[PDB]
Design a protein around this ligand. Sequence first.
Ligand SMILES: *[C@@H]1O[C@H](CO)[C@@H](O[C@@H]2O[C@H](CO)[C@@H](O[C@@H]3O[C@H](CO[C@H]4O[C@H](CO)[C@@H](O)[C@H](O[C@H]5O[C@H](CO)[C@@H](O)[C@H](O)[C@@H]5O)[C@@H]4O)[C@@H](O)[C@H](O[C@H]4O[C@H](CO)[C@@H](O)[C@H](O)[C@@H]4O)[C@@H]3O)[C@H](O)[C@H]2NC(C)=O)[C@H](O)[C@H]1NC(C)=O
Ligand SMILES: *[C@@H]1O[C@H](CO)[C@@H](O[C@@H]2O[C@H](CO)[C@@H](O[C@@H]3O[C@H](CO)[C@@H](O)[C@H](O[C@H]4O[C@H](CO)[C@@H](O)[C@H](O)[C@@H]4O)[C@@H]3O)[C@H](O)[C@H]2NC(C)=O)[C@H](O)[C@H]1NC(C)=O
Ligand SMILES: *[C@@H]1O[C@H](CO)[C@@H](O[C@@H]2O[C@H](CO)[C@@H](O[C@@H]3O[C@H](CO)[C@@H](O)[C@H](O)[C@@H]3O)[C@H](O)[C@H]2NC(C)=O)[C@H](O)[C@H]1NC(C)=O
Ligand SMILES: *[C@@H]1O[C@H](CO)[C@@H](O[C@@H]2O[C@H](CO)[C@@H](O[C@@H]3O[C@H](CO)[C@@H](O)[C@H](O)[C@@H]3O)[C@H](O)[C@H]2NC(C)=O)[C@H](O)[C@H]1NC(C)=O
Ligand SMILES: *[C@@H]1O[C@H](CO)[C@@H](O[C@@H]2O[C@H](CO)[C@@H](O[C@@H]3O[C@H](CO)[C@@H](O)[C@H](O)[C@@H]3O)[C@H](O)[C@H]2NC(C)=O)[C@H](O)[C@H]1NC(C)=O
Ligand SMILES: *[C@@H]1O[C@H](CO)[C@@H](O[C@@H]2O[C@H](CO)[C@@H](O)[C@H](O)[C@H]2NC(C)=O)[C@H](O)[C@H]1NC(C)=O
Ligand SMILES: *[C@@H]1O[C@H](CO)[C@@H](O[C@@H]2O[C@H](CO)[C@@H](O)[C@H](O)[C@H]2NC(C)=O)[C@H](O)[C@H]1NC(C)=O
Ligand SMILES: CCOC(=O)C1=C(NC(C)=O)Oc2cc(O)ccc2[C@@H]1c1cccnc1
Ligand SMILES: *[C@@H]1O[C@H](CO)[C@@H](O)[C@H](O)[C@H]1NC(C)=O
Ligand SMILES: *[C@@H]1O[C@H](CO)[C@@H](O)[C@H](O)[C@H]1NC(C)=O
Ligand SMILES: *[C@@H]1O[C@H](CO)[C@@H](O)[C@H](O)[C@H]1NC(C)=O
Ligand SMILES: *[C@@H]1O[C@H](CO)[C@@H](O)[C@H](O)[C@H]1NC(C)=O
Ligand SMILES: *[C@@H]1O[C@H](CO)[C@@H](O)[C@H](O)[C@H]1NC(C)=O
Ligand SMILES: *[C@@H]1O[C@H](CO)[C@@H](O)[C@H](O)[C@H]1NC(C)=O
Ligand SMILES: [Zn+2]
Length: 858
Amino acid sequence: LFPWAQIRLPTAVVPLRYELSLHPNLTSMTFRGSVTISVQALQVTWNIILHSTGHNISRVTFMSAVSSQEKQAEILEYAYHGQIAIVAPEALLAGHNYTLKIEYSANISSSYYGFYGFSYTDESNEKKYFAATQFEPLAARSAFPCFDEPAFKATFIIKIIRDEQYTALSNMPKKSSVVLDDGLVQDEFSESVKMSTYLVAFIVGEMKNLSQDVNGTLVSIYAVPEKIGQVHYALETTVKLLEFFQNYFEIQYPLKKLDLVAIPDFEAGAMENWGLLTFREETLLYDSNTSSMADRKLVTKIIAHELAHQWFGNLVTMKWWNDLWLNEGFATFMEYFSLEKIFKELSSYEDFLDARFKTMKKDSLNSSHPISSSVQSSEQIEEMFDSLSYFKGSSLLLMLKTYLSEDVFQHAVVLYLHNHSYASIQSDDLWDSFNEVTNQTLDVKRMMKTWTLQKGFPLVTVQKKGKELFIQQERFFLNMKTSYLWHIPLSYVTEYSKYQSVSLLDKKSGVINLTEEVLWVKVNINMNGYYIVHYADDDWEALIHQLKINPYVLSDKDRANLINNIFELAGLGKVPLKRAFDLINYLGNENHTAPITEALFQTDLIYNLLEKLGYMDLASRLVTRVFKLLQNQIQQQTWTDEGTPSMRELRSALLEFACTHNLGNCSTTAMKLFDDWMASNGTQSLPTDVMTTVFKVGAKTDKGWSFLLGKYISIGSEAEKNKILEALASSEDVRKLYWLMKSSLNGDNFRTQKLSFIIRTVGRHFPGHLLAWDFVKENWNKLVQKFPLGSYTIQNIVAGSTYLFSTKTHLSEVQAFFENQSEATFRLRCVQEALEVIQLNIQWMEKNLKSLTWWLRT
Ligand SMILES: *[C@@H]1O[C@H](CO)[C@@H](O[C@@H]2O[C@H](CO)[C@@H](O[C@@H]3O[C@H](CO[C@H]4O[C@H](CO)[C@@H](O)[C@H](O[C@H]5O[C@H](CO)[C@@H](O)[C@H](O)[C@@H]5O)[C@@H]4O)[C@@H](O)[C@H](O[C@H]4O[C@H](CO)[C@@H](O)[C@H](O)[C@@H]4O)[C@@H]3O)[C@H](O)[C@H]2NC(C)=O)[C@H](O)[C@H]1NC(C)=O
Ligand SMILES: *[C@@H]1O[C@H](CO)[C@@H](O[C@@H]2O[C@H](CO)[C@@H](O[C@@H]3O[C@H](CO)[C@@H](O)[C@H](O[C@H]4O[C@H](CO)[C@@H](O)[C@H](O)[C@@H]4O)[C@@H]3O)[C@H](O)[C@H]2NC(C)=O)[C@H](O)[C@H]1NC(C)=O
Ligand SMILES: *[C@@H]1O[C@H](CO)[C@@H](O[C@@H]2O[C@H](CO)[C@@H](O[C@@H]3O[C@H](CO)[C@@H](O)[C@H](O)[C@@H]3O)[C@H](O)[C@H]2NC(C)=O)[C@H](O)[C@H]1NC(C)=O
Ligand SMILES: *[C@@H]1O[C@H](CO)[C@@H](O[C@@H]2O[C@H](CO)[C@@H](O[C@@H]3O[C@H](CO)[C@@H](O)[C@H](O)[C@@H]3O)[C@H](O)[C@H]2NC(C)=O)[C@H](O)[C@H]1NC(C)=O
Ligand SMILES: *[C@@H]1O[C@H](CO)[C@@H](O[C@@H]2O[C@H](CO)[C@@H](O[C@@H]3O[C@H](CO)[C@@H](O)[C@H](O)[C@@H]3O)[C@H](O)[C@H]2NC(C)=O)[C@H](O)[C@H]1NC(C)=O
Ligand SMILES: *[C@@H]1O[C@H](CO)[C@@H](O[C@@H]2O[C@H](CO)[C@@H](O)[C@H](O)[C@H]2NC(C)=O)[C@H](O)[C@H]1NC(C)=O
Ligand SMILES: *[C@@H]1O[C@H](CO)[C@@H](O[C@@H]2O[C@H](CO)[C@@H](O)[C@H](O)[C@H]2NC(C)=O)[C@H](O)[C@H]1NC(C)=O
Ligand SMILES: CCOC(=O)C1=C(NC(C)=O)Oc2cc(O)ccc2[C@@H]1c1cccnc1
Ligand SMILES: *[C@@H]1O[C@H](CO)[C@@H](O)[C@H](O)[C@H]1NC(C)=O
Ligand SMILES: *[C@@H]1O[C@H](CO)[C@@H](O)[C@H](O)[C@H]1NC(C)=O
Ligand SMILES: *[C@@H]1O[C@H](CO)[C@@H](O)[C@H](O)[C@H]1NC(C)=O
Ligand SMILES: *[C@@H]1O[C@H](CO)[C@@H](O)[C@H](O)[C@H]1NC(C)=O
Ligand SMILES: *[C@@H]1O[C@H](CO)[C@@H](O)[C@H](O)[C@H]1NC(C)=O
Ligand SMILES: *[C@@H]1O[C@H](CO)[C@@H](O)[C@H](O)[C@H]1NC(C)=O
Ligand SMILES: [Zn+2]
């Protein structure tokens, strides 16, 4: 009988110091290692419980400090929790330090999880090799036996045997690299600071570097030698942010080195490893002449995310996986917060607003879950890794920073990162630190627990009867045919004099007292609060009018929030749909990107749901109306890569609109630009902001489609290829659309990683709509082999082939598919939320279809 029968490690023995010596071969994908773990007991036990998986233990030696001699001990295993147990020869007593040394043999991983390894092809067709480490959930126990929980912090000394050609890196700077008589170099790195096991990292690969010292901190970027020229934007950005976060958090970067590694595999780990920040190669390559604005924003945000964890998440770690939404939600917040003070040109607020629009649509579903849950299973650990929970957490932290001051927010974080530095905590302690810096006036820990321990988000109903604005609270329930209260930080803007105040609604009913009689009111300023506002019939119609007469009294964030709200409220039936189109009838006087892109989002969802239902004529009258609303804005656009970054995205949105629907000249301007490019054999430049639009119009011909296929299988840019791939799947030849999906699943010409992108693109248009869902049904077993159930890929594939069905016939068809597979498969959240969105599409027609046949075509 194993001495421990729980998923969490015992709170008895605690690690203090790790010595890890490893000999990785990479050619064999087998490594040998020894670990020396200096532990202390705070309680008395005869058995030491710790983690290890897939290790051939050769010897385990126990030792006390009262001897210089090693003692034998027996070792047991319980692989269901990955736990190993060392029975003790001496009853470990309280306070007393002991030392365990384990020798083992193991394989290098091929699953890109744990100590992984792979092969790649260089500038010549040379098989160069590479190894790296991804442990973020529970894979540190696969490389070496340890206490694999984030609370059990310790210091680490990493020692690895390499071959002279291969550079070896880890978390800490390197101390002793000595040559051995075998012909092999052994590197030893400095002893770590107190860090968690999931953040340890070590990498053995043939790389070069583009380093730069600042303030004793040597920021360095490592990549495969053929790609060092394209890492210059990353280093210039990694330095402006390491300055910013240091002076924001008011703590210095703890370590001496900051290494950023671009791993040369597409299935690589991108974790916030302390010192050794791992990324994918395409995530860090940028060129100021060939890459896009959206290619610039992605690199500028992925560095900021992983840099923010070097304070929040590695210096001060969370104790368990129940609070991973807080660590990753803070960094997702720090992405958009750092890139608005020092990278304000990129207009990153337009990205956070769209990400918060989409987070609210999938949190509104009844299949959503409270972010704070109980994690007592390993599947529950590996289901805390949801991008929705990370973006809802950033949405709550935005609401906290706006309700409090920006400065009150920082003072809490600086004090929290000082009090709990080099240790582990829980989510309530951050809320406690807010309550200290607010001088115990308001309770943030109660205010947040209404959002963390609860599902969904509120619907705040508003009715201004004079100078009294009546506010009411409800859950955004979508079934439109228990929950509790939220401490909702309210905000409003009224008006020729402008007002701006902040309140707090802690009841189901409330009234805010206005200082004047006003003509229009807008609640949730810039949608900084995680709620939807339903105004009354008169109150909505005031805002619809003030958008006709000077819409720019509100911000672009606020005008986008109204378009999003009135269209989502109309789908539930709370608003007639003719009121949402009255609201967007102001768009002839709109010049900002964020209200136009969201209005084009809502109309495209209506177009595509109506197109799959067969009401093609009504769908064209919808897009020929938004075109007439946006006709001057579209015709004023230039087919270039010039302007502000926000204006460089309105061009890509409006030209993709006019070309997909063949409205105006767009298609003949793109086809001329395509034909010149096709006839330059791909050597002519296309402006990046019109590149995908040009590729799609040309891919509608057998000639131009076959040219693009040869450019994908040859050319080097895995960003220009993914605009080619989208265009190839925008064909209307069903035979081509089936051949693309068949090829990716079998790994011919395209990679199996890109299959989620192909099925999503084939199924969103009419010629491949039924073809995509049929491919998912008839290749399901092979899909669940190549992507396990509950993966993000299997969720994206199911949603991307199903979210446009709007008939009860289709709802029964999709239900009867998954029921006649497994009860397990029928209870996955991918298939329950999918059958839920078909019902909301079924009812969207029941509440808005026959009315649309009236005002359109009249
Ligand atoms: C704006 O201006 C308005 C009007 O002045 C303010 O609204 C009033 O706030 C006060 C302070 O909280 C409220 O007094 C409390 O009333 C409750 C219950 O009393 C009942 O009284 C009425 C019947 O006689 C009825 O109209 C009330 O209805 C309100 O509440 C219900 C349910 O909560 C809700 O459904 C309604 O929509 C109304 O909102 C209510 O049923 C009483 O329990 C309170 O006593 C507790 O709290 C006080 C401190 O708050 C404490 O001293 C006590 O010891 C006890 O713990 C308190 O008497 C009043 O009811 C509100 N009136 C209305 C019409 O809303 C508003 O606060 C102003 N806002 C701002 C930002 O200034
Ligand atoms: C999208 O369109 C809107 C609507 O046109 C537009 O808002 C306008 O911006 C301009 C530029 O800031 C505003 O003009 C200024 O208003 C301020 C008052 O806030 C004045 O101080 C300014 O006066 C100076 O400049 C004048 C000439 O430009 C001089 O005559 C004067 O003596 C001053 O030197 C200037 O009038 C304008 O008021 C707004 N209009 C509205 C309705 O908001 C917005 O900028 C556009 N956005 C983009 C990205 O194009
Ligand atoms: C892993 O184990 C393999 C053997 O299983 C070791 O392979 C060796 O790889 C090195 C790479 O530097 C080879 O050395 C080279 O030898 C050639 C002469 O053949 C010389 O021209 C080069 O300059 C270089 O010195 C070596 O031949 C090869 N040994 C074999 C194939 O038996 C490898 O060293 C091990 N790696 C580690 C980290 O232990
Ligand atoms: C430094 O961090 C410690 C945590 O290690 C902070 O201690 C915490 O302080 C808050 C503030 O009062 C305590 O919250 C209260 O707890 C009681 C029960 O303990 C509860 O009844 C109240 O409703 C409230 O939630 C919290 O318990 C406490 N935790 C511990 C473990 O002591 C401390 O405040 C921080 N100090 C500084 C200067 O940063
Ligand atoms: C038009 O584009 C096509 C690509 O679809 C070109 O064919 C390819 O051109 C590349 C170079 O641009 C060839 O690579 C070369 O290979 C030779 C060995 O054959 C090597 O010595 C060179 O250093 C270079 O690496 C590639 O072989 C070739 N063929 C294919 C099937 O991809 C074509 O050349 C372009 N036409 C013109 C007129 O440039
Ligand atoms: C490294 O990979 C080898 C691949 O053969 C593993 O060997 C197999 O392991 C399983 C499970 O332990 C056995 O049931 C098979 O009988 C083994 N097959 C062969 C051909 O040896 C090996 O287990 C892996 N390394 C470790 C440490 O588990
Ligand atoms: C790559 O790394 C090397 C090693 O640190 C860098 O070379 C050092 O550069 C510093 C300045 O950053 C000099 O003070 C040292 O004299 C150099 N030492 C050695 C051993 O080379 C190098 O600059 C980095 N960057 C590039 C582009 O090669
Ligand atoms: C960035 C990609 O890194 C990885 O490969 C893994 C990571 N990494 C991070 C940051 O999440 O963890 C999870 C967590 C999950 O819930 C599900 C899958 C994974 C995979 C995994 C697991 C088993 C085999 N192959 C891959
Ligand atoms: C580990 O590998 C060695 C190598 O041959 C083998 O002799 C041994 O039986 C394995 N297991 C143990 C427990 O040492
Ligand atoms: C265990 O090691 C720590 C680190 O030096 C030390 O402070 C502590 O006193 C040691 N325990 C005993 C019983 O000496
Ligand atoms: C340089 O680093 C040291 C490290 O302690 C720090 O004290 C000093 O303030 C830094 N200088 C800066 C950030 O300009
Ligand atoms: C919401 O989901 C739960 C989970 O099974 C279910 O029990 C409940 O009936 C659902 N609510 C509605 C209104 O369908
Ligand atoms: C909290 O109290 C301290 C007392 O010195 C004061 O300096 C600070 O301004 C107060 N904070 C707030 C938000 O009132
Ligand atoms: C389209 O091209 C023709 C070519 O003469 C031109 O007359 C017309 O104005 C163009 N329309 C737009 C919207 O660019
Ligand atoms: Zn992260």
